[PDB]
Design a protein around this ligand. Structure first.
Ligand SMILES: CC(C)(Cc1ccc2ccccc2c1)NC[C@@H](O)COc1cccc(Cl)c1C#N
Ligand SMILES: CC(C)(Cc1ccc2ccccc2c1)NC[C@@H](O)COc1cccc(Cl)c1C#N
Ligand SMILES: *[C@@H]1O[C@H](CO)[C@@H](O[C@@H]2O[C@H](CO)[C@@H](O)[C@H](O)[C@H]2NC(C)=O)[C@H](O)[C@H]1NC(C)=O
Ligand SMILES: *[C@@H]1O[C@H](CO)[C@@H](O[C@@H]2O[C@H](CO)[C@@H](O)[C@H](O)[C@H]2NC(C)=O)[C@H](O)[C@H]1NC(C)=O
Ligand SMILES: *[C@@H]1O[C@H](CO)[C@@H](O[C@@H]2O[C@H](CO)[C@@H](O)[C@H](O)[C@H]2NC(C)=O)[C@H](O)[C@H]1NC(C)=O
Ligand SMILES: *[C@@H]1O[C@H](CO)[C@@H](O[C@@H]2O[C@H](CO)[C@@H](O)[C@H](O)[C@H]2NC(C)=O)[C@H](O)[C@H]1NC(C)=O
Ligand SMILES: N[C@@H](Cc1c[nH]c2ccccc12)C(=O)O
Ligand SMILES: N[C@@H](Cc1c[nH]c2ccccc12)C(=O)O
Ligand SMILES: *[C@@H]1O[C@H](CO)[C@@H](O)[C@H](O)[C@H]1NC(C)=O
Ligand SMILES: *[C@@H]1O[C@H](CO)[C@@H](O)[C@H](O)[C@H]1NC(C)=O
Ligand SMILES: *[C@@H]1O[C@H](CO)[C@@H](O)[C@H](O)[C@H]1NC(C)=O
Ligand SMILES: *[C@@H]1O[C@H](CO)[C@@H](O)[C@H](O)[C@H]1NC(C)=O
Ligand SMILES: *[C@@H]1O[C@H](CO)[C@@H](O)[C@H](O)[C@H]1NC(C)=O
Ligand SMILES: *[C@@H]1O[C@H](CO)[C@@H](O)[C@H](O)[C@H]1NC(C)=O
Ligand SMILES: [Ca+2]
Ligand SMILES: [Ca+2]
Ligand SMILES: [Ca+2]
Ligand SMILES: [Ca+2]
Ligand SMILES: [Ca+2]
Ligand SMILES: [Ca+2]
Ligand SMILES: [Cl-]
Ligand SMILES: [Cl-]
Lengths: 799, 798
């Protein structure tokens, strides 16, 4: 090639820099002989990088210690960011070696993963160390194929993990990817997709672009972008590979998304245009750790076409800066500090420092060769190498074992994969208030040495979402489902995109975004929101509640009246005037009425086994013995008509036999109940589904049937015998009184039937207990009030 | 100068050539302690030598034919690549040497790889030299902005990934795993396949990359990932050498359940198709290109001999590897006595691609030779001469090449330099005679057909796991029968799920349902939540045994009433017993007719009129009957009531009496018609399964006061009857009427519990039975004695 930066010396290096951005887009129709294509657009950043390399080389040549007597020369070429020019230059590099089947010993060539691979395939064939400064693809680590490649820029797996970490930190799960179609974008987005699907993050679309894409492919890509709902768009590409898509996006006014820039185009001047920043607001990109090169800007300001004989690119540089010709003609007096261009309009050195570091590392390897001591070398017999006759593979061997200190005082040392690691800065795009150009204000940091999970660190106070608002935009497929509801599948959409369905009654969902409703335990139940389990609010006939205290009051006043009549009897015990009747029978009847009044107590509280298991036979025996005694408190016609009949001769104790017979019969059934089917004191849910009710299911139905039959037949026979003799003046015609009492007993039975048979849980027990209480109360009152009245009022009883 | 081993032959025009005679280079890790020298290759690839022989045969056959380029001879400088990049780049630097005594090559044939093709093309296209590859199938070599001078005769691999997705869809699998060689052949193909599968809703469990340089730990991780997965389909997208280590490790660890979907590179490779590996990998279904027919090829393959080959140079090492000589031997053995891939083949696939490439370049040269000075493709319609031909001319003519190959086929490279062909689909079968692996075609993938109608598989030929004959199950979660519905698992993809039972009131009829459905109120989820069968209704029917029994009782009562009526007719005007009010007797009898009729209002389905009249029907019927009975006795109050005599002075006042009482009653009735008539409506809340149809009386006070009125009438009549219960005037009807109202009150009391303690229909049933029994008792007790004394004992004087 003609245009190049050439300088002689004892040792020659090679450089490859993208001075231009691309080649002249034209189709070689092949109707005539094809010739060398000329590049089109200028790139001042590449010229700054070239100046950095030249500065490093000359500064090394000025230092007296590093390489004391030797001198470093160079043959730097231009690649125009394509492969053809790079391979032309590379063939111009290995010419002396090519004649095997000006020998350069090292090449610093970079800025394209594709270009870097294309060069390293050829340089590694002659074992020429190539130290790239910007090639960051993960494919260049396959040291089984790129034998002689080392890069002073970190790899690009950490960057994919960092983008995944950023997406996870802002709590997003619905994104979309876009990648240039070269060796830089594809592996990057593959690694990112892997790490994303690991972290449970869904990806909507995935398109590829390139600077040679025709309007139809870009149209399709813009349609895919527009016809989607994800707001986060991760981009892995370089400036020139993204310019057309961005042109289309800004011409179509797509102004909603959030761009996650990769390292290549995060700081590119092709994309950071004030026109573009309208529709591409809120970008968050990565950047390398800045560096310091003392006196570099002063060297930059010295460039001049006439005073540059080694450098040959200063001519076109001046022609491009001042826009002149060597239409208007140039003069060698212009002021480079006047015009504005990415040449001097920088604040931090990020890639230029990489070039400086690469040149200094190669120089340090050379110096290490210079200061070898025999017997301690790295070659066959621990031998050293002749620096005056140094070869490329020796420099490579020494570079693999290089370990020195940088200018900032950091330990530069290449990993066994030939690459040094480094932290990341995280940049947000801002609009400058005074000028109006884009400005990269650093808002985050990414440490690579720290353990997993604790690497990313962002400072959200500075981030400007769309420049207007101040809150993280929402970019999930579907809004979360608050507690009370649960997730639900959509048939085709990915897992990160669902709908919400309500928990059916009886189940609850406390946490948000739950996969399935939970059924409260039987003790508990759904709330009104189906959010919280509330207790089943169990219920039964309580004690302190008005009904319970009132029934207990009635019972105890019954006991009080009974004890009252007992006291009256005891005070006048020795008076058979009214006690001409069997005083023992009065004893028994009064105590039996006490027991009957007490029996009610067994139907109050919560039903355990004890409670009902004894509450049925309690009333049973009590009322049957009461009715038997009041039956015997009558005429003995059948007894007079009838061992047993021998005992029916004299002695009142025979009457007792009667009761001590019939109750015996009764207790038989009861003891049957004891060991045949005791009433199950158990709970019930089926009746209410909301509140448990505790009852007792009598296991022996026919047994209680027989019991009730026995007591009612006793009642029938006693009532009939009473009525048949209801009009006999036997001491105030007591027969009419006993008819009255047993009649009201029958009324109690009848009017009790409908009550319990047509009421809810607690009130059934309440009505049963009030029925038994009223029955026994009425019977006792009717039997004893006449006698107590006549005794307390008129003690004239003779016949 | 290139390497030492090559195949060189002079001529007017020279063609390039790159073939993988070996399989790789020795693992010599240069510590760089000494000057690194040319690395040497290790294994031998007889298939590569067959390809090279195919190219040489094509060239010499061209040189023998007098039609294509007459008076012209073709030459070649074929080199070896050993399947690496450095060797190919050495050969290519030798190629382009004369460009910028040394021959000037004008066309290069093939690179056999994708990385090798890319490396060679980046350098060749710099000088615009046409490179016609025969086996490079990456999709990246179609970008005609990078590789300006690259055309291939093997189809691009996009359709191959599409066909992988189509195969996976055809057997209905949705849980697979992928493996790809980490080079330019596996990565783009596996990316395209991932995209296509994601389109067709196919979940990918794992995805790993391998290479022939993978150290033991990486293969360890890969095999661990393979074991810990539940998938069975493993889509491998790689070549033989890059897969050999993984297959070694797998057959060492004895993983047998999986099934493999082979890409074209290794679906027919002798490196993997070995019985040892076949005993483990089981069933593989791979692709292959369409065969070709090179006439008279075997007769040229059988002529190879070391001393007879001066132009060829690889024949020496070939003889060595096939005979183990130079244990030196003579050099007269027969090559047919050895079993190597150099002759153990049935169809030519890639060798035909090489033959086609050579013939295509020769045809472009011919087209250049047969110019017409006015129609040349070059400038001003002119064209160049055959004697000073340059590479770019051949490239230009190859872009516009369109000719016919001996298979009667049309060959033309499209705008992307590729060709197009329709794939065969093979399955790995074990030879029942020898034990070697044999590939048997089972299907065909036609790419010209419309999308979705391209794949044809003859499933009767496939052999699953060597013995079985039914498609294996390789889904993630078992497809569960209807009645259940899908349920998300946290973290797992959309192909792994649970399924839970549909709660009642909801149903799911089809497999793979997302949610159940609420049934229409007339229906309900059946026993298995599968179908909304009609929700059963329930009420007192007619043809039900109870209905027919009750209407039988009713018609028997009506018949007894008609009997007593006829008895009255035949003996009307004889007041011997009829001295009483015959008219009021007919009134009571009609009242009993209405009472017996009152049954018909509580039988079937409740309409509005039905119950809205069923209440007042019984109401008025009874109150009228009982009031006429109350007046069918002594008239003390009537006798006591000055203006009343002037009003009636006769029995008419009795009518007045009843036409007062009933009237009062009927008042409430009409009120009920226009305050809250009982609505005939349904009821579900008690069973959620059976519908109950009843009537709700909006005014409880109406029915309350009505029943209170009728029972107080009954009670006052009962008291009045019991008052004078002992007056034997005409058989002492007082006792009969006391028994009447007594049985009435028994009916009332004993009816209360039954209706107040039973399920729906039986409430109305027992109400019917109670009313019928009350009217029965009334009729019987009142009139049985009269009809008996009339029919039996003719003694009527007092
Ligand atoms: C058992 C029952 C539900 C009434 C019943 C049930 C089924 C029956 C089947 C055939 C025949 C008679 C039956 C009577 N409730 C009774 C129990 O509370 C026990 O309480 C009493 C039982 C009898 C008499 C009285 Cl004063 C009470 C009270 N207080
Ligand atoms: C209304 C009722 C449920 C009984 C009832 C209800 C609530 C009441 C509230 C206060 C006071 C009395 C009430 C009586 N069932 C009655 C209806 O079937 C009407 O059927 C009759 C009503 C009265 C007498 C007879 Cl012989 C029948 C019959 N057959
Ligand atoms: C979008 O989806 C993500 C994925 O969960 C949601 O992130 C959750 O946010 C809450 C809020 O603190 C965290 O408690 C959870 O830990 C996050 N999920 C997980 C699995 O960790 C995010 O909330 C969703 N965005 C919106 C607006 O709802
Ligand atoms: C990458 O991470 C941090 C910078 O954020 C560096 O580690 C810190 O360095 C300072 C001074 O060197 C120490 O005082 C801190 O203790 C370190 N903090 C942590 C968490 O490590 C680290 O040096 C950076 N990497 C490089 C190559 O500079
Ligand atoms: C593509 O596959 C199909 C069938 O395998 C081939 O197309 C057939 O060609 C012959 C003659 O045109 C017809 O008899 C068949 O009907 C065709 N198939 C159909 C569906 O029409 C074709 O040969 C294959 N492609 C190539 C290049 O050979
Ligand atoms: C594995 O999953 C697939 C779908 O993911 C099942 O195929 C579906 O089920 C029947 C069978 O054809 C069809 O109604 C559906 O259309 C199929 N889906 C598709 C996309 O075709 C397949 O049945 C499952 N495998 C087994 C053994 O059940
Ligand atoms: N890593 C980039 C190289 C790069 C880094 N920063 C850049 C800035 C501009 C252009 C290219 C770059 C690549 O693979 O291509
Ligand atoms: N397409 C394959 C080349 C190939 C086809 N068939 C083959 C058989 C053996 C080896 C390689 C091949 C590749 O990209 O690498
Ligand atoms: C582009 O979109 C924004 C927001 O809707 C709107 O303000 C503007 O008018 C649109 N058109 C142009 C040319 O920007
Ligand atoms: C012109 O050149 C010199 C700097 O060397 C000085 O006069 C001045 O800074 C320059 N002009 C501007 C605008 O900086
Ligand atoms: C590298 O150089 C530094 C400088 O002292 C030293 O600490 C270190 O031991 C050297 N070796 C390695 C492997 O870092
Ligand atoms: C390999 O696995 C299969 C599974 O059945 C088993 O039959 C066979 O014995 C195993 N062979 C070895 C060497 O482990
Ligand atoms: C090889 O030897 C002769 C010569 O080719 C041939 O006739 C014969 O068929 C072959 N025999 C074997 C075993 O290959
Ligand atoms: C060229 O293509 C056309 C149709 O595409 C076909 O008719 C013709 O046979 C082909 N060959 C030549 C020499 O035209
Ligand atoms: Ca470059
Ligand atoms: Ca840029
Ligand atoms: Ca889909
Ligand atoms: Ca090759
Ligand atoms: Ca093979
Ligand atoms: Ca997961
Ligand atoms: Cl910079
Ligand atoms: Cl073959």
């Amino acid at each position: 090639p003609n245009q190049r930066a050439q300088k002689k010396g004892d040792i020659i290096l090679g450089g490859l820099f993208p001075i231009h951005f691309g080649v002249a887009a034209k189709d070689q129709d092949l109707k005539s002989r094809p010739e060398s294509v000329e590049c089109i657009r200028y790139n001042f950043r590449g010229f700054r990088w070239l100046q950095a390399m030249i500065f490093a080389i000359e500064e090394i040549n000025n230092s007296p210690n590093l390489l004391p007597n030797m001198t470093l020369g160079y043959r730097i070429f231009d690649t125009c960011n394509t492969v053809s020019k790079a391979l032309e230059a590379t063939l111009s590099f290995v010419a002396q070696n090519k004649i095997d089947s000006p020998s350069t010993i090292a090449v610093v060539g970079a800025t394209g993963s594709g270009v870097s691979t294309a060069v390293a395939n050829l340089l590694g064939l002659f074992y020429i160390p190539q130290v790239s400064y910007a090639s960051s693809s993960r494919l260049l680590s396959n040291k089984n194929q790129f034998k002689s490649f080392l890069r002073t820029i970190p790899n690009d797996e950490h960057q994919a993990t960092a983008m995944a970490d950023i997406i996870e930190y802002f709590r997003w799960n619905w994104v979309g990817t876009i990648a240039a179609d070269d060796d830089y974008g594809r592996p990057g987005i593959e690694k990112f997709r892997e790490e994303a699907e690991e972290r449970d993050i869904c990806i909507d679309f995935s398109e590829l672009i390139s600077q040679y894409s025709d309007e139809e492919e870009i149209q399709q890509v813009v349609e895919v972008i527009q016809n989607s709902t994800a707001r986060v768009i991760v981009v892995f590409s370089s400036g020139p590979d993204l310019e057309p898509l961005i042109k289309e996006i800004v011409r179509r006014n797509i102004t909603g998304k959030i761009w996650l820039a990769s390292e290549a185009w995060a700081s590119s001047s092709l994309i950071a245009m004030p026109e573009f920043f309208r529709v591409i607001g809120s970008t968050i990109g990565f950047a390398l750790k800045a560096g310091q090169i003392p006196g570099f800007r002063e060297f930059l300001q010295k460039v001049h076409p006439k005073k540059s004989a080694n450098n040959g690119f200063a001519k076109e540089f001046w022609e491009e800066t001042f826009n002149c010709y060597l239409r208007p003609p140039c003069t060698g007096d212009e002021n480079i500090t006047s015009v504005e261009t990415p040449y001097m309009d920088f604040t931090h050195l990020r890639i230029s420092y990489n070039v400086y570091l690469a040149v200094y590392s190669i120089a340090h390897a050379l110096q290490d060769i210079y200061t070898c001591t025999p017997g301690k070398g790295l070659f066959t017999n621990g031998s050293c190498a002749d620096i005056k006759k140094v070869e490329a593979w020796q420099v490579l061997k020494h570079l693999r074992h290089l370990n020195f200190t940088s200018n900032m005082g950091e330990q530069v040392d290449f990993d066994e994969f030939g690459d040094l690691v480094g932290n990341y800065s995280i940049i947000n795009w801002h609009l400058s208030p005074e000028d109006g150009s884009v400005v990269f204000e650093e808002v985050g940091h990414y440490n690579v040495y720290a353990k997993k999970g604790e690497r990313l660190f962002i400072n959200e106070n500075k981030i400007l979402w769309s420049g207007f608002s101040k809150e993280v935009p929402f970019s999930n497929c579907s809004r979360d489902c608050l507690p009370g509801t649960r997730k639900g599948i959509i048939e085709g959409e990915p897992t990160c995109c669902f709908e919400c369905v309500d928990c059916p009654d009886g189940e609850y969902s406390d946490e948000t975004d739950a996969s399935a409703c939970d059924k409260c335990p039987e003790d508990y139940w759904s709330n009104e929101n189906h959010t919280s389990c509330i207790p089943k609010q169990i219920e039964f006939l309580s004690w302190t509640e008005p009904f319970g205290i009132a029934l207990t009051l009635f019972a105890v006043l019954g006991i009080f009246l009974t004890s009252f009549v007992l006291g009256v009897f005891t005070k006048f015990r020795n008076t058979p005037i009214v006690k001409a009747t069997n005083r023992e029978l009065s004893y028994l009847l009064l105590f039996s009425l006490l027991c009957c009044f007490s029996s009610s107590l067994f139907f109050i509280g919560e039903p355990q086994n004890w409670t009902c298991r004894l509450r049925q036979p309690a009333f049973g025996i009590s009322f049957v013995l009461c009715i038997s005694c009041i039956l015997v408190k009558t005429n003995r016609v059948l007894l007079v008509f009838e061992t047993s009949l021998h005992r029916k001769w004299w002695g009142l104790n025979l009457q007792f036999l009667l009761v001590f017979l019939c109750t015996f019969v009764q207790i038989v059934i009861c003891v049957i109940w004891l060991y045949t089917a005791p009433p199950s004191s158990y709970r019930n849910h089926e009746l209410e589904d909301e509140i448990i009710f505790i009852t007792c299911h009598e296991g022996s139905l026919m047994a209680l049937g027989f019991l009730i039959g026995y007591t009612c037949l006793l009642a029938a026979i006693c009532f009939f015998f009473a009525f048949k003799s209801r009009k006999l003046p036997e001491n105030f015609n007591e027969a009419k009184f006993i008819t009255f009492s047993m009649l009201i007993f029958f009324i109690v039975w009848i009017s009790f039937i409908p009550a319990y048979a047509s009421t809810y849980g607690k009130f059934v027990s309440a009505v049963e207990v009030i029925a038994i209480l009223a029955a026994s109360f009425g019977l006792l009152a009717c039997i004893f009030f006449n006698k107590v009245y006549i005794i307390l009022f008129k003690p004239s009883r003779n016949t």
